[PDB]
Write a protein that binds this DNA or RNA. Structure first.
Ligand SMILES: [Mg+2]
Ligand SMILES: [Mg+2]
Ligand SMILES: [Zn+2]
Ligand SMILES: [Zn+2]
Ligand SMILES: [Zn+2]
Ligand SMILES: [Zn+2]
Ligand SMILES: [Zn+2]
Ligand SMILES: [Zn+2]
Ligand SMILES: [Zn+2]
Ligand SMILES: [Zn+2]
Ligand SMILES: [Zn+2]
Ligand SMILES: [Zn+2]
Lengths: 505, 131, 505, 131
RNA sequence: GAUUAGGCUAAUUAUGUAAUUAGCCUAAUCC
RNA sequence: GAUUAGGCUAAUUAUGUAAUUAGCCUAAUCC
């Protein structure tokens, strides 16, 4: 074509171009060798045989489409699908100086895991015999905003040592989460230029030791491995890239992040930028837009956890409705209008935020709403309200427990992935100052046909006895309650609830 | 600061070659899929009275060949990546390369897919008469 | 033992030692793990797992004696025998900086051939998973003496390129001279440190293609070759090392070299250091001490050259004595008291410098004997005097001609190796200003039993005729004289000499 | 600047290992001819109640074995040279090595001339009973 | 130090105008 | 930045003294 690009720019301070036998492109030839027909002439001249010219790596574009090669700069809809592999990524760079001018080189690499890598300033040098990836002269960017980068110029490690560390960190983070690695970036240009130092691409490959997808490449072994088998590997293979700035944002990263989140604050380091970038991506994909058509595959004990949650819900709601003999039930957040317990004869009312059934209302509970349902009990199973009423039974997920189905979110919230992605607000204990912790207990009324527990409400336990029909059932409820509580769920009830009432029923 | 070297129309495939595990196969698959071959190669004015060998110190092109700069037709020099030779020295840089006139559409691809004969220094199948 | 050494010094800037499972020596273990029994304990403490430490290579000592392994630090007496293998060697270094401090790395390598190589700064880095030899950050030494090293810090090449270039240069230099390589060094410490980058040692090996001794090693092929077959090889195999500073010298290299030589001066590069070192070794072994008991093998046309020189001597001295009819001959430098020509009846006197016969004298000709021997002719076959008299027949080797039997010497002189090594002072044409160059001719008087030449003094050529008995002899004389002239020998004679006188004899 | 690591008495053989083509053979030749074995290894204080396997992440030494730091008994770690592994990763560094009590004179040579069994992780001939 | 957009100047090419290249200024983002 | 030699100080070990290690200063050589 005719439009030139800044990619592979000659950054040397030489005043002359190269001879035709040494110049890589026609433009790079000194004009004394050129003729009118876009042809060069081998003049009788001496040549600067030994030379060293720094070449710019800024300006990459991975937009080419070749069959068999995956599309790495994925779109927003695929990023939402691959959310489990999201890693924030930020690079702070250094300016080439002394014998070169006009290119930037990575200095500090930060990831949303909270890890920073400091590297020596290394660039590409063209010589008379080939290319070199070697250390070059560099200086920190001028300005007070980059004053903390001055000490880092004396703490840089070599790139072949840092590549293995990056691969090891990523394998530790994502081994039980995903087979992929999606780098979430802001202003992806310098990020991609830095990614050229430690990433390799190609056709999709299988792990040499199992059936998982390969995520790391070994250049000494020339082999491919998944996260589990990637020990000693020195390249990330086929990562995805996402640019948050292309999702319709103006201004810089900091002002966009500070508008929605007040938790991710601290010193100016690349890791904080990466954390902020991932937080902004989470807010943009799961709070600004809530699309629940995306279904996520199971990776752990999730199906079992759902059934355990339903069992604990049935038992707790039965005990709460029975105790106190409240005949009015209000269920907030039910999208189907189906009661959990039916043995006590009580009136039922259903409410939801986005219902799809005319039987269920569209009420948005905020704070005033306490005196309107004062006559019954209010159900808040998996419903998030910053102020729960006095007469409520509430089940709230603790966002501080980390697991395979719980991911960091925005403003202290968490992304909970159970066949869907729900964003749950931060766990504030001041929202339960009007309620009490629910004690551990069991209640049943099944006919009967050793175990000893003081909280085991059972017709045999009224007289201090026990039977196998309830002995095994208490153990089953025990494992279900333990699974639910260790998964990150917490139960709250009205302050007048007590266990010893259940002896009368 | 600096002097520009490459066209934007060559920016994509070179970027691909800068990231692939095997650059040669990447370029060949890109071209064979309908991608545009590389341009901006250094072509030399030649009186067409040369000997016709593949790689030479001076331009030696016959009536059925064209002379290019050595670094211009090397994929590793164009993409500024590491050369595959164990010695680390490019066999093309600093010399002139003769390409058959029916393969001037993709000189870089021709140099990737062909090698000269060891004894006569002609292209194998394009001048090598070592029957 | 108890004496610590600086070899493998930890040049990192870390303030604590390593854990017992990661430290290579007991000394490198941090003191918190040590007990009083010289034993370590594995504490319940966290380990700083990702680390990198620069390891010093300064302080090598190749003094180990293993059967089957040659001694590489040879002494002076065998260096004199391997004089044909002598290559000067000097390294100019750079200091580790930034993340390391306490070691030097090679920057410029220079040899007595006159070639300099510039390298990237490469050092050993200790990682938690092992070793790696990679580029590190280095700065030029401070001070004005090293200001020329500042530009070279970003002008080097990769070590695998430089290794093959060094092997190629050495193969070019010593192919027709020797099977060996001797590195002549001054202050051999950093030289041996740098030699660790491009030399391999082991048992003595045979070339894979011939019977010559192997001088190069190929690591991609794991093979051994001599200088003739070492194309593409990347390591020098079993080189010798000599430290001239250990030969009893005080001060630095420059003031010791300048005391004896005046022609090796120039800019401050490693190649000039190496040339000065080789010149100083040559002066120490072949001028300061003259041990002519050492025998050197023949490598070329030397036994033929001696006979040709003797034939040329007989013819030239016969013609010189016949022309002018001088009856007195003084032969300087003859240690055997034997004349070469006896057909004219002339008086003979003999002199020598270090003789072993009582018939001869120990005169040291300097300048004043020009009137002492004016009554006859003075013979200077292979004697070195800076002032030749008016009545002399002189043979002097041209030191500017370089051959297999002519090595560079000291103060512009040369070393001529024909069975024994003679140091010949520099060929100065201003010492022959009292003489004339001898024109070519042939003279003989044998009885006779086509060729045409005006300088062929022969009884047939007086009448313009020629015979086979002289035609074949004249072609033999052409051969002998052409060899002698091409070898580097120049003839000078008294100014009144002329060929046309020999017509009367 | 820097901190010293090794003794002078070990400086000779390690220097040899830094220059030879075959470091293991050179070390075994040096110690076989009468050279002193490497010293300054990291010996561990152990309760002498362990499983007795060759290489472990915790000291597991029985009554007939002594435990050493892994990097201290590896010749390639001691001489700071390239490991024979293509990936360059040491099998000893960061772990603890059990040497039989009758072989503690030369731990480095013992680790050079012996290997652990691939199924039971004991030294072959010093604990492995895979008949 | 890098890119994007806008303005000005100069050069080349093409047919008063357009494209590209080079330099300067402003704004945004990145460093 | 490296080593060697000398001096001073401190610590450890051994039996007033000796050795080793660590730091500072002087000189020489190397960079
Ligand atoms: Mg940032
Ligand atoms: Mg020097
Ligand atoms: Zn796997
Ligand atoms: Zn945030
Ligand atoms: Zn019962
Ligand atoms: Zn090339
Ligand atoms: Zn051929
Ligand atoms: Zn050979
Ligand atoms: Zn000299
Ligand atoms: Zn005759
Ligand atoms: Zn090791
Ligand atoms: Zn076994």
């Amino acid at each position: 074509s005719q439009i030139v690009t800044g990619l592979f720019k000659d950054c040397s301070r030489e005043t002359s171009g190269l001879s035709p036998a040494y110049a890589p492109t026609y433009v790079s030839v000194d004009d004394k060798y050129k003729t009118s027909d876009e042809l060069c002439v081998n003049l009788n001249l001496p040549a600067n045989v030994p030379y060293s010219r720094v070449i710019s790596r800024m300006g990459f574009k991975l937009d080419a489409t070749v069959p068999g090669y995956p599309k790495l700069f994925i779109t927003r809809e695929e990023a939402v699908r691959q959310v489990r592999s999201w890693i924030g990524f930020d690079v702070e760079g250094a300016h080439a100086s002394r014998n070169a001018c006009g290119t930037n080189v990575p200095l500090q690499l930060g990831f949303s895991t909270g890890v920073n890598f400091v590297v020596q300033p290394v660039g590409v040098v063209d010589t008379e015999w080939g290319n070199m990836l070697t250390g070059i002269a560099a200086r920190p960017p001028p300005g007070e905003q980059f004053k903390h980068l001055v000490p880092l110029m004396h703490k840089g490690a070599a790139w072949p040592i840092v590549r293995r560390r990056i691969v090891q960190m990523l394998s530790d983070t994502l081994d039980k989460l995903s087979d992929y690695c999606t780098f979430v970036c802001w202003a992806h240009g310098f990020a991609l230029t830095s990614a050229s130092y430690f990433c390799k691409i190609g056709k999709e490959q299988k792990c040499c030791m199992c059936n998982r997808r390969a995520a790391a490449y070994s250049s000494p072994l020339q082999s491919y491995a998944c996260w589990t088998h990637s020990c000693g590997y020195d390249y990330v293979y086929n990562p995805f890239f996402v640019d948050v700035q292309q999702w319709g944002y103006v201004g810089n990263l900091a002002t966009n992040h500070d508008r929605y989140c007040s938790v991710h604050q601290g010193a100016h380091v690349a890791s904080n930028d990466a954390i902020m970038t991932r937080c902004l991506a989470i807010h943009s994909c799961f709070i600004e837009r809530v699309d629940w058509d995306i279904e996520y595959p199971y990776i752990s004990h999730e199906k079992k956890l759902n059934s355990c949650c339903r069992i604990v819900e049935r038992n707790v709601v039965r005990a709460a409705l029975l105790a106190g003999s409240f005949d009015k039930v209000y269920d907030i957040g039910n999208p189907k209008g189906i009661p959990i317990v039916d043995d006590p004869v009580v009136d039922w009312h259903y409410f939801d935020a986005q219902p799809l059934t005319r039987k269920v209302q569209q009420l948005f509970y905020t704070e005033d709403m306490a005196s309107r349902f004062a006559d019954g009990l209010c159900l808040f199973w998996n419903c998030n309200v910053p102020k729960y009423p006095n007469n409520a039974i509430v089940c709230r997920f603790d966002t501080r427990v980390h697991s395979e189905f719980n991911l960091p979110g925005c403003d202290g919230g968490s992304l909970y992935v159970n066949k869907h992605a729900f964003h749950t607000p931060a766990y504030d204990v001041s929202a339960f100052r009007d309620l009490k912790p629910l004690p551990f207990f069991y209640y049943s009324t099944t006919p009967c046909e050793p175990l000893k527990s003081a909280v085991c409400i059972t017709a045999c336990n009224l007289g201090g006895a026990v039977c196998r029909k309830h002995a095994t059932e208490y153990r089953e409820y025990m494992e279900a309650y333990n699974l639910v509580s260790a998964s990150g769920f917490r139960l709250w009830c009205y302050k007048t609830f007590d266990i010893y009432n259940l002896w009368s029923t | 600061a600096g002097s520009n070297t490459e066209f934007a129309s060559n920016s994509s495939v070179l970027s691909l070659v800068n990231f692939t595990v095997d650059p040669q196969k990447a370029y060949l698959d890109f071209v064979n899929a309908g991608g545009a071959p590389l341009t901006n190669c250094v072509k030399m004015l030649t009186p067409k009275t040369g000997t016709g060998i593949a790689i030479s110190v001076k331009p030696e092109s016959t009536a059925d060949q064209e002379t290019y700069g050595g670094a211009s037709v090397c994929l590793y020099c164009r993409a500024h990546i590491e050369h595959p030779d164990v010695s680390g020295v490019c066999k093309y840089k600093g010399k002139f390369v003769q390409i058959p006139a029916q393969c001037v559409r993709d000189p870089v691809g021709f140099c990737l897919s062909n090698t000269p004969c060891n004894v006569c220094q002609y292209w194998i199948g394009y001048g090598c008469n070592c029957d």
